[PDB]
Design a protein around this ligand. Structure first.
Ligand SMILES: [Mg+2]
Ligand SMILES: [Mg+2]
Ligand SMILES: [Mg+2]
Ligand SMILES: [Mg+2]
Ligand SMILES: [Mg+2]
Ligand SMILES: [Mg+2]
Ligand SMILES: [Mg+2]
Ligand SMILES: [Mg+2]
Ligand SMILES: [Mg+2]
Ligand SMILES: [Mg+2]
Ligand SMILES: [Mg+2]
Ligand SMILES: [Mg+2]
Ligand SMILES: [Mg+2]
Ligand SMILES: [Mg+2]
Ligand SMILES: [Mg+2]
Lengths: 71, 122, 116, 167, 85
RNA sequence: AGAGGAGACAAGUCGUAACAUGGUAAGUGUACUGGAAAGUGCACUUGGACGAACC
RNA sequence: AAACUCCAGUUGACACAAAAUAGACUACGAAAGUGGCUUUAACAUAUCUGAACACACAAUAGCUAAGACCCAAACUGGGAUUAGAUACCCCACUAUGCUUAGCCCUAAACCUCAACAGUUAAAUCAACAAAACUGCUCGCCAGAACACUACGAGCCACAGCUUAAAACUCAAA
């Protein structure tokens, strides 16, 4: 068989990689912001969990971990 | 298991060769081996030059030590032979007589392979 | 003859294929043509002797007559041998048979990779 | 492990083996043999200790005992060769096969299954119902939910004292 | 480390250096050394080496079978016994 | 809303990357590099060929 | 041409690199892979299928940290070629290929042909390819392109990998 479909996929992948290389800084900034918002959403969900249960504050000795930070 | 140590010793006079063989067999016994036989293949020119302990050997005395040793002693004996200076080259193998030769009826002929391609007309 | 059992990738063959032919392993009813041998430059040694003698004798033919004659004889022998080689190729004595006669023989007894 | 002086499985049932030279006893001992002879001796000991019929090898109990000996050998091998992925796979697959065999034996013959578990020191554990990834978010939320439940239990316990005192 | 003038050595007979060199080259060719050197001039990647080996094995099988058929049928190259019919 | 992407519209411009051994076989993964198709390294695939007796 | 002439040739000493011939053998492994020698341990399952909701592996490339460095070699530099040559050709060298400890988890990972049991009976059979099938089970597929993409989620991965759309468009692919 010919490689026309493979050639189309090859060009698509090459152009995508070049696009990523061109905008690798704005994408990194957007990813950092998304991770921030993701951690915020997780913390809000945990807060909802302990609020619906009647606790006025977080359980004693509990601090929500930063599970999405690079560290 | 039953091992055979093929030993190439530096070409020396008879007292030195006897002392080296005694030292090697004593080391084997100390590591636990039961030595069964010591066979001399004679002194002969090596097939190729061997450089052992900063010395080039052209001739060597060939010996075999058949023995029964625990599996753990083979590594220690290899280390001991490596440290020895009178041994040009020592290799421990599993005894060839241990592996029994299965009987062979004969060369079974291989017929030409068939039905590899469809019989459709081409 | 090397075995073909379990070599090609086929149904019921568990192992990975050994051979991956680009053409079916089926005998054709013809053989390849009598391939020519690419000609090499000839009489180079005699030419070298003649040219070295020319260099030593300042390209004076009178001194170099013997080597010049040797080179000329080698050249004539090479040309006549090329003609004789063409004649021999037409004859086909060197090979067991010419490709044309072998193709005729294979035509008489063709391969049958099909049923009938 | 069996003592190194232990004779091989084949040679321990020949008459007069106790009257032979100590060298002969050494040669026929587990000391002068590979580890698989020791594994066979271990298997024989386990069969004599556990199964009702020591001479039966096709029974599920015999298969479980042999697989347990193989598993122990694999673990001993991996303790020295910690980067042997092939034997790691063999150990894990043998563990799964032994779990399957123990499930079958427990379904078929429970008393013998208990004898197997006691003799071989196998703690038969029922598989968990759901095999799902416990990623960071899920683990953290599960931990917080457990802590919240404990705090709510404490609050519910404390709520009773005031009502009891008031009444 | 081996001895010299034993391996790949051919003695010349009555100054027939041409025949001695031909014999040496034939020995190297039959043992496959010449092809090995030619292929070792540049590195042959393992996929390329496998492809070449497969092609050469298929070629050997086909050539041996064709030679067998030719030798089998060569007896039938004789004169036509029923000429005219 | 500044922009990016895809498709259509289809021009002009710079090359000719692919289809023949496409003129350096093509492609996959991956890494680096380049105006651009793309180039190169490493391993893999035939969805290439090696001409199919000897010569 | 550039480059080296502390270069080349012989001889001797000489490795943490790679393993002619055997191999016209077709073996081992679940796959990836595995073809120098020795030794040790060792190659699951006395029905079969079965995990993308897990566990363990997974060529090459690549990252991290410490070493080795003959040879090869992205990048880079030089020479050449060319209209240009950011390539093909030549030279030098680095990351890298190797060792150890972790990662990364991707391949035309393809024998593009699932596992098990069975048949060659016929109604054999679109074409080509590596003949046509039956029973059972699991996984996958449902026009092309958008799309090995976006968003969401998970990951030691941060220009990444896995899962993976939709809108606009066409009568094709
Ligand atoms: Mg596109
Ligand atoms: Mg082109
Ligand atoms: Mg090209
Ligand atoms: Mg390429
Ligand atoms: Mg480049
Ligand atoms: Mg299964
Ligand atoms: Mg990997
Ligand atoms: Mg380097
Ligand atoms: Mg170099
Ligand atoms: Mg270069
Ligand atoms: Mg190495
Ligand atoms: Mg592969
Ligand atoms: Mg990809
Ligand atoms: Mg993606
Ligand atoms: Mg995303």
């Amino acid at each position: 068989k010919n490689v026309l479909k493979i050639r189309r996929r090859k060009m698509n992948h090459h152009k995508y990689r070049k696009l990523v290389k061109k905008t690798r800084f704005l994408r990194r900034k957007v990813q950092e912001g998304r991770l921030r918002r993701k951690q915020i959403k997780f913390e809000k969900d945990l807060r909802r969990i302990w609020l619906k249960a009647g606790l006025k504050e977080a359980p004693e000795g509990w601090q929500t971990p930063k599970i999405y930070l690079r560290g | 298991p039953r091992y055979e140590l093929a030993l190439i010793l530096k070409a020396m006079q008879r007292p030195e060769t006897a002392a080296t063989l005694k030292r090697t067999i004593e080391a084997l016994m100390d590591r636990g081996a039961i030595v069964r036989d010591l066979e001399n293949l004679g002194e002969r020119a090596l097939p190729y030059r061997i450089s052992a302990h900063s010395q080039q050997h052209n001739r060597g005395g060939y010996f075999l030590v058949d023995f029964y040793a625990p599996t753990a002693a083979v590594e220690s004996m290899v280390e001991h032979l490596s440290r020895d200076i009178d041994v040009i080259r020592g290799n421990i193998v599993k005894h060839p007589l241990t592996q029994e030769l299965k009987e062979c009826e004969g060369i079974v002929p291989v017929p030409l392979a068939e039905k590899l391609y469809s019989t459709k007309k081409r | 003859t090397p075995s073909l059992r379990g070599r090609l990738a086929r149904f019921g063959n568990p192992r990975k294929p050994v051979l991956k032919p680009n053409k079916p392993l089926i005998l054709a009813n013809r053989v390849g043509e009598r391939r020519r041998e690419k000609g090499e430059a000839t009489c180079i040694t005699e030419m070298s002797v003649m040219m070295a003698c020319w260099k030593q004798n300042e390209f004076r033919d009178d001194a170099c007559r013997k080597e010049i004659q040797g080179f000329l004889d080698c050249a004539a022998r090479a040309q006549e041998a090329r003609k004789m080689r063409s004649i021999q190729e037409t004859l086909g004595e060197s090979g067991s048979l010419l490709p044309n006669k072998l193709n005729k023989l294979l035509q008489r007894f063709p391969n049958k990779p099909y049923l009938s | 492990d069996p003592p190194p002086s232990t004779l091989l499985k084949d040679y321990q049932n020949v008459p007069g083996i106790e009257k032979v030279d100590d060298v002969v006893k050494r040669l026929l001992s587990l000391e002068m043999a590979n580890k698989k002879e020791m594994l066979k001796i271990k298997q024989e000991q386990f069969m004599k200790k556990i199964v009702a019929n020591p001479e039966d090898t096709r029974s599920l109990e015999a298969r479980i005992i042999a697989l347990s000996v193989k598993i122990r050998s694999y673990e001993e091998h991996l303790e020295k060769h910690r980067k042997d992925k092939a034997h790691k796979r063999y150990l894990l697959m043998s563990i799964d096969q032994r779990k399957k065999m123990l499930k079958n034996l427990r379904n078929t013959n429970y008393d013998v299954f208990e004898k197997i578990c006691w003799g071989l020191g196998i703690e038969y554990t029922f598989p968990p119902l759901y095999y799902r990834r416990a990623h960071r978010r899920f683990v953290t939320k599960k931990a917080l939910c457990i802590r919240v439940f404990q705090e709510t239990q404490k609050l519910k316990k404390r709520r009773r004292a005031l009502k009891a005192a008031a009444a | 480390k081996h001895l010299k003038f034993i391996a790949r050595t051919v003695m010349v007979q009555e100054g027939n250096v041409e025949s001695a060199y031909r014999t040496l080259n034939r020995i190297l060719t039959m043992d496959g050394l010449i092809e090995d050197i030619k292929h070792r001039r540049y590195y042959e990647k393992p996929c390329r080496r496998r492809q070449r080996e497969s092609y050469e094995r298929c070629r050997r099988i086909y050539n041996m079978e064709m030679a067998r058929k030719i030798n089998f049928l060569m007896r039938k190259n004789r004169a036509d016994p029923w000429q005219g019919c």
